[PDB]
Design an enzyme around this catalytic site. Structure first.
Site, PDB file in Angstrom:
ATOM      1  N   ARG A  37       0.791  -1.205   0.000  1.00  0.00           N
ATOM      2  CA  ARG A  37       0.000   0.000   0.000  1.00  0.00           C
ATOM      3  C   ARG A  37       0.841   1.280   0.000  1.00  0.00           C
ATOM      4  NH1 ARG A  37      -5.370  -1.571   3.808  1.00  0.00           N
ATOM      5  NH2 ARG A  37      -6.771  -1.831   2.010  1.00  0.00           N
ATOM      6  N   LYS A 204     -13.884  -8.934   8.883  1.00  0.00           N
ATOM      7  CA  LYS A 204     -14.715  -7.719   9.002  1.00  0.00           C
ATOM      8  C   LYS A 204     -16.167  -8.091   8.718  1.00  0.00           C
ATOM      9  CE  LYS A 204     -11.110  -4.293   8.400  1.00  0.00           C
ATOM     10  NZ  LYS A 204     -10.371  -3.238   7.591  1.00  0.00           N
ATOM     11  N   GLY A 362      -5.953  -5.239   2.098  1.00  0.00           N
ATOM     12  CA  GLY A 362      -4.694  -5.094   2.804  1.00  0.00           C
ATOM     13  C   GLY A 362      -4.117  -6.412   3.279  1.00  0.00           C
ATOM     14  N   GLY A 385     -12.667  -4.085   1.025  1.00  0.00           N
ATOM     15  CA  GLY A 385     -14.063  -3.615   1.055  1.00  0.00           C
ATOM     16  C   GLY A 385     -14.318  -2.536   0.005  1.00  0.00           C
TER      17      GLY A 385
HETATM   18  N1  LIG Z   1     -12.038 -17.904  10.779  1.00  0.00           N
HETATM   19  C1  LIG Z   1     -11.445 -16.719  11.072  1.00  0.00           C
HETATM   20  N2  LIG Z   1     -11.475 -16.158  12.278  1.00  0.00           N
HETATM   21  C2  LIG Z   1     -10.869 -14.972  12.565  1.00  0.00           C
HETATM   22  N3  LIG Z   1     -10.167 -14.228  11.672  1.00  0.00           N
HETATM   23  C3  LIG Z   1     -10.076 -14.722  10.417  1.00  0.00           C
HETATM   24  C4  LIG Z   1     -10.717 -15.977  10.024  1.00  0.00           C
HETATM   25  N4  LIG Z   1     -10.480 -16.193   8.699  1.00  0.00           N
HETATM   26  C5  LIG Z   1      -9.706 -15.156   8.309  1.00  0.00           C
HETATM   27  N5  LIG Z   1      -9.474 -14.269   9.299  1.00  0.00           N
HETATM   28  C6  LIG Z   1      -8.698 -13.015   9.242  1.00  0.00           C
HETATM   29  O1  LIG Z   1      -9.256 -12.141   8.270  1.00  0.00           O
HETATM   30  C7  LIG Z   1      -8.332 -11.070   8.223  1.00  0.00           C
HETATM   31  C8  LIG Z   1      -8.530 -10.250   6.973  1.00  0.00           C
HETATM   32  O2  LIG Z   1      -9.890  -9.829   6.813  1.00  0.00           O
HETATM   33  P1  LIG Z   1     -10.145  -8.376   6.152  1.00  0.00           P
HETATM   34  O3  LIG Z   1      -9.378  -7.353   6.923  1.00  0.00           O
HETATM   35  O4  LIG Z   1     -11.623  -8.238   6.018  1.00  0.00           O
HETATM   36  O5  LIG Z   1      -9.475  -8.607   4.720  1.00  0.00           O
HETATM   37  P2  LIG Z   1      -8.726  -7.466   3.763  1.00  0.00           P
HETATM   38  O6  LIG Z   1      -7.656  -6.857   4.568  1.00  0.00           O
HETATM   39  O7  LIG Z   1      -8.172  -8.225   2.604  1.00  0.00           O
HETATM   40  O8  LIG Z   1      -9.819  -6.495   3.369  1.00  0.00           O
HETATM   41  C9  LIG Z   1      -6.943 -11.714   8.332  1.00  0.00           C
HETATM   42  O9  LIG Z   1      -6.118 -10.957   9.206  1.00  0.00           O
HETATM   43  C10 LIG Z   1      -7.249 -13.138   8.802  1.00  0.00           C
HETATM   44  O10 LIG Z   1      -6.414 -13.575   9.907  1.00  0.00           O
HETATM   45 CL   LIG Z   2     -16.440  -5.136  10.541  1.00  0.00          CL
HETATM   46 MG   LIG Z   3      -7.845  -6.049   6.463  1.00  0.00          MG
END
Ligand SMILES: Nc1ncnc2c1ncn2[C@@H]1O[C@H](COP(=O)(O)OP(=O)(O)O)[C@@H](O)[C@H]1O
Ligand SMILES: [Cl-]
Ligand SMILES: [Mg+2]
Length: 405
Positions: A37, A204, A362, A385
């Site tokens: 990023r 999230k 991210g 998102g």
């Molecule tokens: N079953 C789960 N329980 C808790 N956290 C999880 C699970 N599966 C994935 N994650 C977490 O989801 C996080 C990323 O989600 P998010 O921030 O929404 O994605 P991005 O950053 O790609 O937008 C990672 O840090 C990962 O550890």
């Molecule tokens: Cl959230």
């Molecule tokens: Mg994230």
């Protein structure tokens, strides 16, 4: 951005530039685990300096400190250090983002100064929750730090936050990363190859469960994995889910979402098995569970299991286009990384036989860094998102707030 001012047409000679960027980088053991990023904003920053900007003041959030100063946990200071190596210029870090001290540091800087402000979300006024008069004052303060504004924060463009929509300067321009990402998605989303699969995982859940309704009008299949799945499985299967991530509000719409998927002919693939953990820790004790067995009380599902990976693979094989946001387990910790690695293997294989594959976010883009697949999928996006909100067919608030031509 045909209708919006962009940086290629913004006169920056002798101007202070205040620039919103998405420097919400992943961190593990306090080290930056992916500089994606930061690197992605360098072209806009360098352009400003190369075309005579007096200064470039950079502002971002980091994590979700919820309007309280948390310098011990969510400081941007390490990013400033990293930006130096990537830019080839030094950067001055300020320990706040507003106030008289910050205003003085930015008022009349030496020619060519690069300045990074502290985490914007240390102030409740950035999100606007965690007051209208203090929100105005916060926005007024940010606006004093440059003469012209640039928004290059694609990853944050879905957020109608003060630094993103509230800066009051005559010229508000989209940066080159904003333009690159919006152009890629505009082309890829105009007439997707079909079947078009969305893969929705991650953590999230409260935010992203609310994006499914409109995504169901655009895609032909959806994998619902990672932390997202447990809200669905508790409601649909009466599954015991232990301490796994759960969203009370989203639970109330799960049946309606499944009804809509049926109406629209969208095949939904949920996991059927799990790697469990006795606490949220890299060195937790671990176990296995199925939807039929349930997850024991006091344990959380942190990865899918092998039968889930097979079902995810089947959906990837049918796909001609894929948008993936959210790992399908806690891939940062090796005990919980196998499901995400297996899915990455499948997505890379799909790309090689002609699938258009888009991975964004991210954290999810850090999967590509970790397993060296950044050049083995069609597009790795800095938005997670933000990219899903594009898939829904919306105009992002950070784009809407830019100056019209
Ligand atoms: N079953 C789960 N329980 C808790 N956290 C999880 C699970 N599966 C994935 N994650 C977490 O989801 C996080 C990323 O989600 P998010 O921030 O929404 O994605 P991005 O950053 O790609 O937008 C990672 O840090 C990962 O550890
Ligand atoms: Cl959230
Ligand atoms: Mg994230």
């Amino acid at each position: 951005l045909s209708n919006k001012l962009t940086l290629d047409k913004l006169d920056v000679k002798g101007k202070r530039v205040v620039m919103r960027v998405d420097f919400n980088v992943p961190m593990k053991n306090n080290q930056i685990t992916n500089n994606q990023r930061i690197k992605a904003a360098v072209p806009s920053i360098k352009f400003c300096l190369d075309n005579g900007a007096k200064s470039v003041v950079l502002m971002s959030h980091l994590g979700r400190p919820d309007g309280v100063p948390m310098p011990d946990k969510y400081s941007l200071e390490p990013v400033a250090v990293e930006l130096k190596s990537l830019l080839g210029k030094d950067v001055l870090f300020l320990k706040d983002c507003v106030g008289p001290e910050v205003e003085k540091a930015c008022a009349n800087p030496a020619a060519g100064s690069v300045i990074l402000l502290e985490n914007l979300r240390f102030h409740v006024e950035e999100e606007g929750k965690g007051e209208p008069a203090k929100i105005e004052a916060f926005r007024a303060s940010l606006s004093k730090l440059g003469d012209v504004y640039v928004n290059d924060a694609f990853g944050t463009a879905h957020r109608a936050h003060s630094s993103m929509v509230g800066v009051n300067l005559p010229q508000k321009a989209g940066g080159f990363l904003m333009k690159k990402e919006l152009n890629y998605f505009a082309k890829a989303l105009e007439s997707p190859e079909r079947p078009f699969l969305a893969i929705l995982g991650g953590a999230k859940v409260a935010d992203k469960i609310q994006l499914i309704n409109n995504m169901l009008d655009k895609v032909n299949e959806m994998i619902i994995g990672g932390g997202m799945a447990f809200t669905f499985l508790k409601v649909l299967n009466n599954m015991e889910i232990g301490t796994s991530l759960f969203d009370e509000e989203g639970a109330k719409i799960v049946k309606d979402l499944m009804s809509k998927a049926e109406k629209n002919g969208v095949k939904i693939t949920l996991p059927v098995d799990f790697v469990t953990a006795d606490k949220f820790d890299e060195n937790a004790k671990t176990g296995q569970a199925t939807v039929a067995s349930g997850i024991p009380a006091g344990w959380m599902g942190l990865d899918c299991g092998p039968e889930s990976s097979k079902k995810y693979a089947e959906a990837v094989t049918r796909a001609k286009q894929i948008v993936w946001n959210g790992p399908v387990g806690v891939f940062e910790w090796e005990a919980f990384a196998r499901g995400t690695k297996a899915l990455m293997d499948e997505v890379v294989k799909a790309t090689s036989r002609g699938c258009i594959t888009i991975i964004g976010g991210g954290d999810t883009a850090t999967c590509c860094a970790k397993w060296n697949t950044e050049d083995k999928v069609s597009h790795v996006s800095t938005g997670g998102g933000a990219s899903l909100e594009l898939l829904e067919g919306k105009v992002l608030p950070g784009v809407d707030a830019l100056s019209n031509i």
